[PDB]
Amino acid sequence: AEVARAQAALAVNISAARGLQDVLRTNLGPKGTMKMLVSGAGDIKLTKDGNVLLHEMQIQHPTASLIAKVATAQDDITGDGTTSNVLIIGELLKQADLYISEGLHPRIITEGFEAAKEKALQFLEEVKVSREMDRETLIDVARTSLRTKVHAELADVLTEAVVDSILAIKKQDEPIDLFMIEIMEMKHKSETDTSLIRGLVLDHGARHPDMKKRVEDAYILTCNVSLEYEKTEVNSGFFYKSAEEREKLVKAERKFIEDRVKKIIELKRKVCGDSDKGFVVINQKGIDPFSLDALSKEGIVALRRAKRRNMERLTLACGGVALNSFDDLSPDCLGHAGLVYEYTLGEEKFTFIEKCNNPRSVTLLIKGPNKHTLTQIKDAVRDGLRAVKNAIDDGCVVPGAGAVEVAMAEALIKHKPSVKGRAQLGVQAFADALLIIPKVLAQNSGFDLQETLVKIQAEHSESGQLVGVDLNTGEPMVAAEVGVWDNYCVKKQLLHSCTVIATNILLVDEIMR
């Protein structure tokens, strides 16, 4: 095939990744902008988020395949700062371009990158402080962490909702959420409205004129594949081997509809008293209207159209036994919920299971009929749930919004990485690539980006105080008293991912197609 073996082969490589960063330079901030994204079949999506804009749709670049790999591991380990990791390496190619533009080795630039991280990883221990597991401590982090990823008005409605979700653990040690993540979209009049309810919300409730609505000590009978068969948890076809074999099945099916509603109502007399305690049937599939008569007149809140994903978290939400049958297996095969309530708003009926044995699954009830809002308000949830969980997993949170970037660059003063000056090379392009997060915001704001950046450095050298850049003015301010604090799990991981790929770019001086 054809070869490209020159410094121009690196020069095409470093050129593609910087321009893709400047597209994403529009993002990452409350003063940063949402990016409109349209699918191949067409779907309006307004995301500021890094991974969604990167992994879904992109244009032809070999660097685009490279940055998808490292933003994966940032999304894998943390799930936040997928905006933030792109902006470092774009500048990191830029000052490193200049020395090879002067003419220097790609490997002498590479080796100063490693000492740049090691001088800064030890500084990451210094700059973070021990912060609390307080809700209000996590309020300051969450609303800050949302504004770097999504919009500020999106941050305001979610600041109370995200912090109370992750707080339901009993010191469960995990950096991201797993079962708190449950998103129930809802057609509303308000596109932007958010309701956090403890426990699991059912995607479709059900109503009969005799069916109850509020039940307490609700003994759940979790239900599945339906009345027409018997003792089945999975669907089946029909026998076509003989013409009479097709007929003999469906004549018996109406009898099994009778038999399986009979087992449910006779279990309600045994376990729930007469009607003294609540009883809830959660069917995965459709409810026959004959059993809609027979269950609801018993006083049973029967439910329709559940997901099998909802079945699995219902086992955690009840904490007991969540079945998949209608028949009487055993009376102690019933999970317990002290409160199950179906609230109906809008077009859809939403059934809640509460008094959970495990406060591990909560659900954000998500409003908005328009999909472009309903996509975007859902997209603010998933990055919000993981990032604040990083803050509660970490005992120490870094104070962020760029205050570390001037702090390390002054602390990366040279002749300490002095071996031949080749280590002084890689730390110097590193320190200038630190400052992009103060460069992007005062670009997006007023107070011209490098004119006030040196004013941050002039103030930070005074008394060693951490001073950041305002998200709405671009003016200098202390990051601690204001509380503009970034996740340390982002910030610690940020050094590793940005170092390794810019190393890998300098190892690529040949490209073949």
Binding site: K35, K189, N370
Partner: protein, 509 residues
């Protein structure tokens, strides 16, 4: 396609979509709009004076155009008319920002200038209410207020059509205050002129109707989408055309098989049987003898309007009907709808969801034109069940807003300050629209609506007072707005605009 480069999506795409928003409500909306011709995928000329119909008809590949369309979908859902108001207001406000971009402002900076100021304008919005009045039982009260609703999509008979639309929504729901979602289905009968349009309570099958009533005390139905050419609970027969001797045998047995069908439907409870398809000839000969009612050949939309209101779905076969697929109506009776005899049902609040207004005219596009104005007035009564607070007519409201917002801008100072100065200038698109609806200059009208300082009642209509432009009292004229109807119209227009301002480039894999 659908993704480009070169500062297009931010600066250049947004003003391009505003040109599509230009001349869409700028002469086609006001106290009296002007027609626009649209041809759908079915070949027909269509007049449009409502924003949501034409933009649903108009296909765009521009995603920036698709944002405000979804906002106007809410403003039909929440308010009704004023989706036209959404376009030129958001269309002006987007075009004012690029001059601030040539100053060198950021996108989110002038977004913030629009966010705090639409919060500010919504605080001024209770101070614009003038002459609150509400009577949910008085047709004369409602026909005065729904006049300007149907003024905005008509030019001819306002007094004839305002009395009809005020009669329906009151009399279909005499418990008004929690008024239903939709309660009027139109009946387009081509023929006699616009003075033959009238209101009929209950479902009207203006298609062909055979037989007669079985009982008028009950009007239960078993709505079937399937023809009656031999379709039975057993093995479904068809019209035997394969053999002429089989055609004679099927003709002799059909009335006996039609006897098995009508007793399978009426004993379960029905006096009217809905026929979407056909009825066989001998099957039609027996239904006159059994005196059961058949209504043959209803459209799919006619099938939809029936299945929505009675709660009974159409069936693909003949059977003894289940309870969940039978509907009940109060009465069924043969009365002339537009002085031509078709059948008409009865739906009280026990049945609800429909009170028909028959559309009659020498042109169906006129019947399509009055179809535009009645859709907003349905929600406007639902607006009226929410608020009793009346705002004066369009454009006279915006000029009082612009003065305080300009005074509010200088009290901010910032670079949001200049956006708030532009935010007052998006208000003046509504007197720019009515001047362009008249075909007269705007800044002379803008200079007049400035100088009055009573300004909250003063605008120029689509009048001979707009020939040489001269202000008038919109409130005294009968051209009205309301509190919540203008509230969501500003709220949803400012919401979609700053988001479609915020947009960036698109990449596509």
């Amino acid at each position: 396609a659908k993704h480009f480069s070169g500062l297009e999506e931010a600066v250049y795409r947004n003003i391009q979509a505003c040109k599509e928003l230009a001349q869409t409500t700028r002469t086609a909306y006001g106290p009296n709009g002007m027609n626009k011709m649209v041809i759908n995928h079915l070949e027909k000329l269509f007049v449009t004076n409502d924003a949501a119909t034409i933009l649903r008809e108009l296909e765009v590949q521009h995603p920036a155009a698709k944002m405000i369309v979804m906002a106007s979908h809410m403003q039909e859902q929440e308010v009704g008319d004023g989706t036209n108001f959404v376009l030129v207001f958001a269309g002006a406000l987007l075009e004012l920002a690029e001059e601030l971009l040539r100053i060198g402002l950021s996108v989110s900076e002038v977004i913030e200038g629009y966010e705090i100021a639409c919060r500010k304008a919504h605080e001024i919005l209770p101070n614009l209410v003038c002459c609150s009045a509400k009577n949910l039982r008085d047709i004369d009260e409602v026909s005065s207020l729904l006049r300007t609703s149907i003024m905005s999509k008509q030019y001819g008979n306002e007094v004839f059509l305002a009395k009809l639309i005020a009669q329906a929504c009151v009399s279909i729901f005499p418990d008004s205050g929690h008024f239903n979602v939709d309660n009027i289905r139109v009946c387009k009968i081509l023929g006699s002129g616009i003075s033959s349009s009238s209101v009929l309570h209950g479902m009207v099958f203006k298609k062909e109707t055979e037989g007669d009533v079985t009982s008028v005390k009950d009007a239960k139905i078993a709505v079937y989408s399937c023809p009656f050419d031999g379709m039975i609970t057993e093995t479904k027969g068809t019209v035997l055309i394969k053999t002429a001797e089989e055609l004679m045998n099927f003709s002799k047995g059909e009335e006996n098989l039609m006897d098995a069908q009508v007793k399978a439907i009426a004993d379960t409870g029905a006096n009217v049987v809905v026929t979407g398809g056909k009825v066989a000839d001998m099957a039609l000969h027996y239904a006159n003898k059994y005196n059961i009612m058949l209504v043959r050949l209803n459209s799919k939309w006619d099938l939809r309007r029936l299945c929505k209101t009675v709660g009974a779905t159409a069936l693909p076969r003949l059977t003894p009907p289940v309870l969940e697929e039978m509907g009940h109506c109060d009465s069924v009776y043969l009365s002339e709808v537009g002085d031509t005899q078709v059948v008409v049902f009865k739906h009280e609040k026990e049945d609800g969801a429909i009170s028909t207004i028959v559309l009659r005219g020498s042109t169906d596009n006129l019947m399509d034109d009055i179809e535009r104005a009645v859709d907003d007035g349905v929600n406007t009564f639902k607006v009226l069940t929410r608020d009793k607070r009346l705002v004066p007519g369009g454009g006279a409201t915006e000029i009082e807003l612009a003065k305080q917002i300009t005074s509010y801008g200088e009290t901010c100072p910032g670079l949001e300050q200049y956006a708030i100065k532009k935010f007052a200038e998006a208000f003046e698109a509504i007197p720019r629209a009515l001047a362009e609806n008249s075909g007269v200059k705007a800044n002379e009208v803008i200079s007049k609506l400035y100088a009055v300082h009573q300004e909250g009642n003063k605008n120029v209509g689509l009048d001979i007072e707009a020939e040489v432009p001269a202000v008038k009292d919109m409130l005294e004229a009968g051209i009205l707005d309301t509190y919540l109807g203008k509230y969501w119209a500003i709220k949803l227009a400012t919401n979609a605009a700053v988001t479609v301002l915020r947009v960036d480039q698109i990449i596509m894999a």
